[PDB]
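Hi R.,

Here are the chain sequences for the assembly we discussed:
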Amino acid sequence: PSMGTLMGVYLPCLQNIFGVILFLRLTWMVGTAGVLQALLIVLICCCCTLLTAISMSAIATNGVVPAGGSYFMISRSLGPEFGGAVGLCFYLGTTFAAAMYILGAIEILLTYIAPPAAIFYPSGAHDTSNATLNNMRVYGTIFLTFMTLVVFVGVKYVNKFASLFLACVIISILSIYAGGIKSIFDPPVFPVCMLGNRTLSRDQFDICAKTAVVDNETVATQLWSFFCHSPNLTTDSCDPYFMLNNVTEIPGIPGAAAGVLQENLWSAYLEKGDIVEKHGLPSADAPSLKESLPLYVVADIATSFTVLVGIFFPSVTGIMAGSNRSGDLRDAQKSIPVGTILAIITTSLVYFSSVVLFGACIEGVVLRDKYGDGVSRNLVVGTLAWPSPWVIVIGSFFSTCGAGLQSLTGAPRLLQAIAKDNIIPFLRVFGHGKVNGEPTWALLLTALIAELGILIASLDMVAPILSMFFLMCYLFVNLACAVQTLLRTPNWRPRFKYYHWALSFLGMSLCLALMFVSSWYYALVAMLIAGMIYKYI
Amino acid sequence: PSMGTLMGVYLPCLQNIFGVILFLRLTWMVGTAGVLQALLIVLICCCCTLLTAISMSAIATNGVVPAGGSYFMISRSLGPEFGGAVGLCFYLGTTFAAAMYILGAIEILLTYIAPPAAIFYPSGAHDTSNATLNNMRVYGTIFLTFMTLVVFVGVKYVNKFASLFLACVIISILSIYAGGIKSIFDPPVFPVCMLGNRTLSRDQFDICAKTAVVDNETVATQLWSFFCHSPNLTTDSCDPYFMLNNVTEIPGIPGAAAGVLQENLWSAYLEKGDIVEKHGLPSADAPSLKESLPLYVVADIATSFTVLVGIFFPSVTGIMAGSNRSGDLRDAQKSIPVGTILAIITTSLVYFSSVVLFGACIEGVVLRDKYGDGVSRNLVVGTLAWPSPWVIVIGSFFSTCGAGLQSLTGAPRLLQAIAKDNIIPFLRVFGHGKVNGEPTWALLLTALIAELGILIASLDMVAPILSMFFLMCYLFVNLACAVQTLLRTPNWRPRFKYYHWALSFLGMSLCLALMFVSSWYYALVAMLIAGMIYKYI
Ligand SMILES: C[C@@H]1CC[C@@]2(OC1)O[C@H]1C[C@H]3[C@@H]4CC=C5C[C@@H](OCCC(CO[C@@H]6O[C@H](CO)[C@@H](O[C@H]7O[C@H](CO)[C@@H](O)[C@H](O)[C@H]7O)[C@H](O)[C@H]6O)CO[C@@H]6O[C@H](CO)[C@@H](O[C@H]7O[C@H](CO)[C@@H](O)[C@H](O)[C@H]7O)[C@H](O)[C@H]6O)CC[C@]5(C)[C@H]4CC[C@]3(C)[C@H]1[C@@H]2C
Ligand SMILES: C[C@@H]1CC[C@@]2(OC1)O[C@H]1C[C@H]3[C@@H]4CC=C5C[C@@H](OCCC(CO[C@@H]6O[C@H](CO)[C@@H](O[C@H]7O[C@H](CO)[C@@H](O)[C@H](O)[C@H]7O)[C@H](O)[C@H]6O)CO[C@@H]6O[C@H](CO)[C@@H](O[C@H]7O[C@H](CO)[C@@H](O)[C@H](O)[C@H]7O)[C@H](O)[C@H]6O)CC[C@]5(C)[C@H]4CC[C@]3(C)[C@H]1[C@@H]2C
Ligand SMILES: *[C@@H]1O[C@H](CO)[C@@H](O[C@@H]2O[C@H](CO)[C@@H](O)[C@H](O)[C@H]2NC(C)=O)[C@H](O)[C@H]1NC(C)=O
Ligand SMILES: *[C@@H]1O[C@H](CO)[C@@H](O[C@@H]2O[C@H](CO)[C@@H](O)[C@H](O)[C@H]2NC(C)=O)[C@H](O)[C@H]1NC(C)=O
Ligand SMILES: *[C@@H]1O[C@H](CO)[C@@H](O[C@@H]2O[C@H](CO)[C@@H](O)[C@H](O)[C@H]2NC(C)=O)[C@H](O)[C@H]1NC(C)=O
Ligand SMILES: *[C@@H]1O[C@H](CO)[C@@H](O[C@@H]2O[C@H](CO)[C@@H](O)[C@H](O)[C@H]2NC(C)=O)[C@H](O)[C@H]1NC(C)=O
Ligand SMILES: [Cl-]
Ligand SMILES: [Cl-]
Ligand SMILES: [Cl-]
Ligand SMILES: [Cl-]
Ligand SMILES: [K+]
Ligand SMILES: [K+]
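And here is the predicted structure of the full complex:
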């Protein structure tokens, strides 16, 4: 074994922690929650994982660190019963993370790369969502079957391109920060068209004006005809909000300044159907027609604190991938606790600094446009990039497609190990393999379980389920590190300096409170199942 | 044993088949789907149960009919493996039926008996639903804990009042038909106020007119001030749909005639947010303000065929309660197949004739008002009653509160039997009992599983889950009656005249297609779990 801390522990953690939510949902989270509550979300979600890494360090500093995987360390150092629970929750988390990574790639493809590559179209006036869901499901079943065939044939090729997907993430992050520094002295041009407080969808009309001049004549624009249903300048069919108010352009990226950061500082939660609005604009109050409602940027889902925590939390998962090469290391009891804790610290500093950067550079109206309707269907992250917005689009697409392949390779190997371990006999039949040792019936079960996550067809609906499984895995790791100290069981002497049982107890309680914060109902279901297995024993 | 067919098999089936959906959701289903598609829903949902009763007759005509319950017949006549599946699916169905019966009683209490007995109020303008859900959950946890204490103490008293809850159902059905016959020559007076096609909520304003006369002076009414935001007769702040249209009263119950039945004959499916409208009225087309949207009757959920099937199907469940007294009967191989099939035929004739009666007597605008907003917060069923609408309100409340108690008494006894039967050792610890033999740890598990159904807090969200469990139970009964004939296993010789294996095969395929019709996603989950247990064996 010859593999150091950097390329053995640190870089796989840093590759498995960054992902889809930094490029699709972080600006939305900043603009919805405010800078202060977004920093609070990042702080709370990075203390479950830091305390869980302190417990995993106490795992790795005990004994020999047996070769192969993070399942075998836990199972040989904690007894089989905690090992089975940690392994099964981590397996279900990895299989739904594959589905979330596929849904992210299809959102990027259908909204930014090729919008004409769309099968189902929003017929009628309203319900653009059912066309969107049925459009996500078809491409989800296509990409999932293609990638399971790739994993069924070409594992050697998936292991080959693993550095390129990390290079794409790092180049696309450095482009964000390079453009954010340039926005201090030279911000880019993305004008946002508004009407009173209300922001509107710029993709539908031509010019952001109420009237124009053609051939020495004042003629109503296309924007007049959507609100007034007549090309005449003196009709009374207009809605009274359009008549009393005026149409105004603003800079979408006003540049890095303290005045922009002061406006983005507090929460602006909306319900489903509300309109994204500024705060410092004059707006005469008036009723508005129901028919002019598609001419605005509308909140897609109802938001709160507990909604945003469950969507953010799978950004911080990825600790457990620092022990998959635990046999290949030179000093596994030293390279694991340093590598995972430094990876959590660096990725958490990237999230804090990016929350402050997006809160200081981008205006909160553009931030709250999930899918970027206020600026001509562009990434809100991509408009801040330095060379072009296409670098972030292409790089985030290839990185999410790589992160899906890595989950579809990592989860059947894990189910293979629990099957051959024979703690649960009900999972006996998934120990079959080929002559290479590659799993067959486990790959089918991961493809069918990740299919049930793809048929939910939303990035915002699958991510609380991921939070729910990774929080159970991290809860049982902290239970099994606190109980073995309080019971004084033999062969449990962790040689880690910064370990204490109260830290693992605090980590257990925090990763249990986040389980209720993310979704209280399914946490209350899992509490019943856990309280029933305890009565079984 | 001295107990005949009528009081032993027929009356418990007829008591357990009628219930909450005949009084709360049948008029809504007729008005939404049309008379023809409502008869098609009743026909399809009564052919799964008739074929399942033909299979249960082949169970009862084999062998001895061992004493006690419907679980012991199936388990001794089909092998333990099918018996465990049928028993566990029927247990989960009974525990969620308790939750649906509690949610029905709380809907009746909070909307018709005591609307001031409401904790959470709809603050703001919109979202009257979250106040409603949080208002259902609190009273659900109160009624569930009270009834589990009653079952924990007073089983002898719950068995005593069992005839009174059947008397309430039969009196409240006879009042419906007595009022429906009276509506031929003397219909009751329930005027419905409308504005163009759109129907409005009469509970908010006083008089159904656009202007009135007070003290020899034409003054705008209260209904003017909601749409125009000014008491002056000559303002231009009115929405243009209110100006171009006129306000009209219609009879809500126009009486039994062929012309009313001809209008109610075809489907009118709406999406969530649409307005209930007539078809034969003049209405000038115009836009409408967003602020006047609470002044209408709005569709609560999006409806289709597959939505209404899953809501209707737990009306027809209740076959399996014809064998709970299988030891007390004089001739159990004769009293069961006659009693259950005659009970299914009589209850299905009641549903067909009531669908035709509500389609012929009540106007389809009043039928599509779930919660009865178009007529002064009254039951749509209750307005057709002969003495008073209060008889149906009180009788349906007491019958649903009795049907919840009967499920909370029947499900822990069933889990007790599967625990003592020892096919699944994981359920070993639920075989404990008191000195009376009454279950203790099973009653706790039924109270915690029915709590997870109450925390969904909708009658329309729990009923597809009930359909999902009773259809799996009825599928395994037909599998176990077809496979034992095709495999020619010993000790399976059913002495029933009208049994054939193709009928049970057709019943299996129909109760599998209804599983996809009711909700395709959770059926696709259960298909995975069933295909995994088969690979285990
Ligand atoms: C050890 C061995 C390994 C394999 C195995 O065991 C043995 O492992 C286990 C693990 C199992 C899996 C465990 C967990 C599971 C998750 C479970 O999902 C629960 C709820 C979610 C799914 O929602 C469903 O999604 C479908 C599809 O949309 C819906 O079906 C609909 O489909 C069509 C649409 O065209 C239509 O007919 C209807 O819409 C409907 O039929 C279901 O109805 C729906 O329940 C998460 O969804 C939740 O939905 C909420 C919406 O109300 C949402 O709330 C918010 O919604 C929006 C946000 O988008 C906002 O407006 C508001 O803020 C809220 O209203 C929630 O966010 C969201 O959580 C499914 C099963 C599965 C995968 C288990 C499968 C078996 C399993 C793998 C076993 C194996 C054997
Ligand atoms: C043998 C031994 C015995 C005991 C045991 O095993 C051992 O038995 C098993 C059996 C287990 C149970 C099996 C099945 C279960 C059902 C499962 O529910 C699945 C989905 C449904 C629940 O929905 C959830 O409801 C909660 C509460 O609302 C939501 O949480 C929300 O709460 C708040 C609201 O304030 C807010 O934060 C968010 O809204 C959210 O957090 C969940 O999100 C939600 O998933 C059914 O709900 C489905 O919801 C759809 C809405 O999207 C709806 O679609 C339609 O919705 C409306 C209609 O109303 C229409 O507009 C459209 O037509 C559609 O959108 C669907 O109709 C609806 O199906 C929960 C677990 C449970 C009970 C298992 C528990 C364990 C169990 C008993 C074991 C034991 C151990
Ligand atoms: C919308 O913007 C226009 C600017 O074109 C505002 O116009 C007012 O115009 C009159 C006469 O042209 C001036 O005397 C006022 O000083 C203007 N008001 C200003 C500059 O605030 C108009 O008031 C705006 N509408 C609003 C703010 O509701
Ligand atoms: C944007 O402008 C509106 C008025 O044009 C602001 O005022 C609110 O308007 C709604 C009407 O839907 C009223 O119900 C509220 O009471 C109004 N709030 C007031 C008067 O304080 C609205 O607040 C503005 N949005 C912002 C500042 O984010
Ligand atoms: C609403 O109802 C009124 C009835 O009061 C209709 O009034 C019309 O009134 C003029 C003059 O009073 C008559 O000459 C017309 O014959 C009436 N039209 C009829 C009876 O159809 C009014 O047209 C109605 N509005 C509609 C149908 O949009
Ligand atoms: C009730 O009246 C409206 C017009 O007052 C009817 O017409 C439809 O109106 C909508 C506007 O929301 C249009 O999009 C449709 O194209 C109209 N349909 C037509 C003209 O056929 C509406 O159909 C009526 N409702 C009924 C008869 O149930
Ligand atoms: Cl991620
Ligand atoms: Cl992880
Ligand atoms: Cl019922
Ligand atoms: Cl039944
Ligand atoms: K991650
Ligand atoms: K029933």
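Residues 5-183+304-536 of chain B form a domain with the Amino acid/polyamine transporter I fold (CATH 1.20.1740.10). Residues A 19-21, 314-315 surround chloride ion (ligand 7) (CB under 6 Å).

Let me know if anything looks off.

Best,
T.
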